[PDB]
Amino acid sequence: GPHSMRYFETAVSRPGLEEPRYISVGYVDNKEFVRFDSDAENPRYEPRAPWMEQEGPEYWERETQKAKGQEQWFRVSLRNLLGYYNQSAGGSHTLQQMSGCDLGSDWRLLRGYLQFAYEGRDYIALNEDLKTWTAADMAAQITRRKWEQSGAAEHYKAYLEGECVEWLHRYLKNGNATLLRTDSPKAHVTHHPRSKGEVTLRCWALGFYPADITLTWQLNGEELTQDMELVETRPAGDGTFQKWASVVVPLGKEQNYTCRVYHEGLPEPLTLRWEPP
């Protein structure tokens, strides 16, 4: 399967206090693996996945020291932007960043990734080429020319194809057991009566990991396209997930409809329908 590493950095301006709250969150295959938070008693990078503990105290030190460097980059970036967007205020301002790399199944680099956002909207992004920039608006164009002159793209390129990839290989090597791991969904259909002589059939899918799941309702071989209601895959809180899909179906004709659950943790796809006591 494909692999990814991302660093989701956030800087939230604190009005009055002349240092925002920096939060770097590291993900390997969409799973949080490292985290840095300036709001901590003693701010440092902390292992957010067990396999991350195999690193030495210097890996933590190199990272924590990088974080201190970023915390500063954000302060300034955050100030300059407030400048560009005539916001000179003691109103909180939020600057975010997503940087990382995607790999094929062969662990060969596919894409370099670098996106920035100010106040929830895209500000600037380095293109797939890892050479050119795209600015969202006029103020973002300042950063573009600023960074075209700086040659800043080249360093990010160097990191995304170099450090990012080399590192991701270590992490995948080290986390293999935890990363290849899957919790299968435990499914069931619930009967929810309603008006106009109808019943809603809720196909529940619980305690599954990864969050990628497909829930389908079938009326005797035909896969339902629209009479279906789907909730966004939500975390159980215990590290697993939950999702459900419901269909409004005419009464009695209950067992004409069948739910199918497709998940990679399943020995085979779950086929289930309404079981009345």
Binding site: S24, G26, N80, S99, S150, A152, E163
Partner: peptide, 9 residues
């Protein structure tokens, strides 16, 4: 392992 941004915005 994280990166460090160079030039500010």
């Amino acid at each position: 392992a994280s990166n460090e941004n160079t030039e500010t915005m």
